[PDB]
Design a protein around this motif. Structure first.
Motif, PDB file in Angstrom:
ATOM      1  N   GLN A  93       6.647  20.825   2.218  1.00 47.74           N
ATOM      2  CA  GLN A  93       7.067  19.440   2.103  1.00 47.74           C
ATOM      3  C   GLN A  93       8.403  19.388   1.395  1.00 47.74           C
ATOM      4  O   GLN A  93       8.821  20.371   0.781  1.00 47.74           O
ATOM      5  CB  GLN A  93       6.052  18.598   1.325  1.00 47.74           C
ATOM      6  CG  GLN A  93       6.040  18.880  -0.139  1.00 47.74           C
ATOM      7  CD  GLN A  93       4.894  18.202  -0.866  1.00 47.74           C
ATOM      8  OE1 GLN A  93       4.455  17.104  -0.504  1.00 47.74           O
ATOM      9  NE2 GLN A  93       4.370  18.880  -1.880  1.00 47.74           N
ATOM     10  N   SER A 152      20.045  14.647  12.469  1.00 48.14           N
ATOM     11  CA  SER A 152      18.926  14.359  11.577  1.00 48.14           C
ATOM     12  C   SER A 152      19.392  13.475  10.425  1.00 48.14           C
ATOM     13  O   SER A 152      20.508  13.622   9.924  1.00 48.14           O
ATOM     14  CB  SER A 152      18.337  15.670  11.052  1.00 48.14           C
ATOM     15  OG  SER A 152      17.163  15.447  10.299  1.00 48.14           O
ATOM     16  N   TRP A 171      17.528  16.262   5.611  1.00 44.23           N
ATOM     17  CA  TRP A 171      17.183  17.676   5.642  1.00 44.23           C
ATOM     18  C   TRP A 171      16.857  18.126   4.234  1.00 44.23           C
ATOM     19  O   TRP A 171      17.290  17.509   3.261  1.00 44.23           O
ATOM     20  CB  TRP A 171      18.284  18.554   6.237  1.00 44.23           C
ATOM     21  CG  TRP A 171      19.651  18.321   5.701  1.00 44.23           C
ATOM     22  CD1 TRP A 171      20.044  17.357   4.819  1.00 44.23           C
ATOM     23  CD2 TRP A 171      20.835  19.014   6.091  1.00 44.23           C
ATOM     24  NE1 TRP A 171      21.398  17.424   4.617  1.00 44.23           N
ATOM     25  CE2 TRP A 171      21.909  18.434   5.388  1.00 44.23           C
ATOM     26  CE3 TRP A 171      21.090  20.076   6.963  1.00 44.23           C
ATOM     27  CZ2 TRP A 171      23.215  18.884   5.521  1.00 44.23           C
ATOM     28  CZ3 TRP A 171      22.380  20.523   7.098  1.00 44.23           C
ATOM     29  CH2 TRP A 171      23.431  19.930   6.378  1.00 44.23           C
ATOM     30  N   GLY A 197      14.983  22.602   6.614  1.00 44.07           N
ATOM     31  CA  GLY A 197      14.044  21.823   7.388  1.00 44.07           C
ATOM     32  C   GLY A 197      14.490  20.409   7.716  1.00 44.07           C
ATOM     33  O   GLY A 197      15.178  19.750   6.919  1.00 44.07           O
ATOM     34  N   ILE A 198      14.122  19.957   8.915  1.00 42.51           N
ATOM     35  CA  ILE A 198      14.370  18.577   9.347  1.00 42.51           C
ATOM     36  C   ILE A 198      13.141  18.061  10.072  1.00 42.51           C
ATOM     37  O   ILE A 198      12.377  18.830  10.665  1.00 42.51           O
ATOM     38  CB  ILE A 198      15.603  18.459  10.269  1.00 42.51           C
ATOM     39  CG1 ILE A 198      15.328  19.123  11.631  1.00 42.51           C
ATOM     40  CG2 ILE A 198      16.850  19.043   9.600  1.00 42.51           C
ATOM     41  CD1 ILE A 198      16.442  18.953  12.676  1.00 42.51           C
ATOM     42  N   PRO A 199      12.899  16.755   9.995  1.00 43.53           N
ATOM     43  CA  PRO A 199      11.790  16.151  10.751  1.00 43.53           C
ATOM     44  C   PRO A 199      12.141  15.835  12.201  1.00 43.53           C
ATOM     45  O   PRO A 199      13.290  15.526  12.528  1.00 43.53           O
ATOM     46  CB  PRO A 199      11.520  14.852   9.971  1.00 43.53           C
ATOM     47  CG  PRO A 199      12.839  14.505   9.362  1.00 43.53           C
ATOM     48  CD  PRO A 199      13.497  15.812   9.029  1.00 43.53           C
ATOM     49  N   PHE A 225       7.770  18.967  11.219  1.00 42.39           N
ATOM     50  CA  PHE A 225       8.992  19.550  10.681  1.00 42.39           C
ATOM     51  C   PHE A 225       9.419  20.752  11.524  1.00 42.39           C
ATOM     52  O   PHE A 225       8.582  21.490  12.051  1.00 42.39           O
ATOM     53  CB  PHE A 225       8.814  19.997   9.221  1.00 42.39           C
ATOM     54  CG  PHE A 225       8.821  18.876   8.235  1.00 42.39           C
ATOM     55  CD1 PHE A 225       9.976  18.164   7.988  1.00 42.39           C
ATOM     56  CD2 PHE A 225       7.684  18.555   7.526  1.00 42.39           C
ATOM     57  CE1 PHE A 225       9.983  17.127   7.074  1.00 42.39           C
ATOM     58  CE2 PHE A 225       7.691  17.517   6.604  1.00 42.39           C
ATOM     59  CZ  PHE A 225       8.842  16.806   6.381  1.00 42.39           C
ATOM     60  N   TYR A 226      10.736  20.976  11.581  1.00 44.67           N
ATOM     61  CA  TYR A 226      11.371  22.105  12.253  1.00 44.67           C
ATOM     62  C   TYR A 226      12.239  22.839  11.238  1.00 44.67           C
ATOM     63  O   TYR A 226      13.054  22.204  10.554  1.00 44.67           O
ATOM     64  CB  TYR A 226      12.263  21.652  13.419  1.00 44.67           C
ATOM     65  CG  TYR A 226      11.585  21.013  14.627  1.00 44.67           C
ATOM     66  CD1 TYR A 226      10.823  21.770  15.515  1.00 44.67           C
ATOM     67  CD2 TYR A 226      11.785  19.667  14.921  1.00 44.67           C
ATOM     68  CE1 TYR A 226      10.231  21.194  16.619  1.00 44.67           C
ATOM     69  CE2 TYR A 226      11.202  19.082  16.029  1.00 44.67           C
ATOM     70  CZ  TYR A 226      10.428  19.849  16.874  1.00 44.67           C
ATOM     71  OH  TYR A 226       9.852  19.258  17.975  1.00 44.67           O
ATOM     72  N   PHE A 227      12.075  24.168  11.143  1.00 44.28           N
ATOM     73  CA  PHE A 227      12.668  24.961  10.066  1.00 44.28           C
ATOM     74  C   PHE A 227      13.627  26.040  10.575  1.00 44.28           C
ATOM     75  O   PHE A 227      13.366  26.703  11.582  1.00 44.28           O
ATOM     76  CB  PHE A 227      11.575  25.632   9.206  1.00 44.28           C
ATOM     77  CG  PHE A 227      10.632  24.657   8.529  1.00 44.28           C
ATOM     78  CD1 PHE A 227      11.055  23.897   7.449  1.00 44.28           C
ATOM     79  CD2 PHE A 227       9.312  24.544   8.941  1.00 44.28           C
ATOM     80  CE1 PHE A 227      10.199  23.022   6.825  1.00 44.28           C
ATOM     81  CE2 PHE A 227       8.456  23.680   8.314  1.00 44.28           C
ATOM     82  CZ  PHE A 227       8.901  22.918   7.253  1.00 44.28           C
TER      83      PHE A 227
END
Length: 341
Positions: free
Chosen positions: A16, A308, A311, A324-326, A334-336
């Motif tokens: 998170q 995004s 981040w 990370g970004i949603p 999330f995408y990392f």
DNA sequence: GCCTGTCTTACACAGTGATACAGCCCTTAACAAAA
């Protein structure tokens, strides 16, 4: 600086905004999971290992003499040199702010399986009010070691806090706190050069100095482009703190900092305005009395990153950041990515 | 001697327009009780 997408295992939900990564002897660990720790991992501390762009979070255990610290979001962390980690403050899963300070160290590494010691340090003297989004670093002066803590936010004081604005926060007063871990004591120093409150700033510690970069001030709602040097001399039992403003400061809140070589650090990410993101990157080169901030080549951001709004990330230690970004649509929460230097 | 989401239907009930059933005030004369 090469950007690389990362896949995550079954427990991706743990990661998170506000999490932290700590590096012990090349091994990376993850702390500050979302939610209270479950039976699968009672500590809330995880081996954080990326093999072939795939991230696995594997539960880590605590020693018999450990605290079980609650998960903490946006705590102040630093590294102490017999290598250990200092965690102070942060928000708990119940949204309370902690005034406690925890120390993480390796208790036992048997067959490449680490057991941790988490010890709580009591603090007396001028204890800093519970905070999040503040800095703490270690300075070395005259063969003595001292902790420097500055900034952050907290709830209103018990006198003025009211339930209609129960979650409202304010910047803490900009007092530098010297913290002796050996004795468990804290001393507050008011400096004339630090007039405003500051949080989510970057702190770089070299020898007897800590530099303060960027950050965000709530009252003004400004992300000031100031750079502050805070020097600490420790002659016997009478410490002394002096601050100097140095022009050429970046304006950034929530940036991430990594060390690429001794006396050179990279600053990536963060926000320049509420709706704008700092897409550029900075290189900071350190001298014994000088600090140099140079623009560097911006990485090859993907369109997802460029568009995004938020981040978040942490320093992995080996000059590599975990970002990370949603994302919406169908799919993942999330995408990392991992940005190397 | 596991944990813990995801998946899958069982299941009850909501809430539709239609429909069946019960309860309504009477309607013939006369006494008559309260007023």
């Amino acid at each position: 600086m090469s950007l690389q997408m990362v896949t995550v295992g079954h427990n991706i939900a743990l990661i998170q905004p506000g999490f932290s990564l700590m590096n012990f002897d090349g091994q990376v660990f993850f702390f500050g999971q979302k939610g209270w720790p479950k039976r699968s991992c009672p500590t809330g501390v995880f081996h954080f290992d990326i093999k072939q762009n795939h991230l696995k979070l594997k539960p880590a255990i605590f020693s018999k003499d450990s605290c079980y610290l609650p998960p903490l979001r946006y705590p102040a962390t630093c590294s102490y040199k017999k290598h250990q980690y200092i965690i102070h403050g942060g928000k708990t899963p119940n949204n309370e702010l902690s005034d406690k300070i925890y120390i993480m160290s390796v208790a036992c590494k048997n067959n490449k399986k680490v057991t941790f010691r988490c010890t709580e340090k009591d603090l007396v003297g001028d204890v800093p009010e519970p905070r999040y989004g503040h800095s703490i670093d270690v300075v070395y002066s005259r063969g003595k070691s001292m902790g420097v803590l500055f900034g952050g936010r907290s709830y209103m004081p018990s006198t003025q806090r009211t339930t209609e604005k129960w979650n409202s926060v304010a910047d803490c007063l900009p007092h530098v706190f010297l913290i002796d871990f050996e004795f468990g004591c804290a001393t507050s120093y008011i400096l004339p050069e630090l007039q405003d409150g500051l949080s989510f700033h970057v702190s770089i510690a070299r020898n007897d100095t800590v530099y303060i970069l960027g950050g965000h001030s709530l009252a003004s709602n400004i992300r000031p482009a100031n750079l502050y040097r805070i020097r600490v001399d420790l002659p016997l039992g009478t410490p002394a703190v002096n601050c100097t403003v140095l022009p050429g400061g970046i304006s950034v809140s929530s940036a991430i900092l990594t060390q690429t070589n001794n006396d050179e650090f990279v600053i990536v990410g963060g926000y320049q305005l509420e709706n704008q993101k700092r897409m550029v990157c900075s290189l900071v080169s350190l001298g014994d009395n000088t600090i140099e901030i140079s623009e560097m080549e911006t990485p090859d951001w993907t369109s997802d990153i460029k568009h995004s709004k938020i981040w978040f990330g942490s320093n992995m230690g080996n000059g590599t950041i975990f970002l990370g970004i949603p994302g919406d649509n169908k799919s993942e929460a999330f995408y990392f990515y991992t940005l190397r230097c």
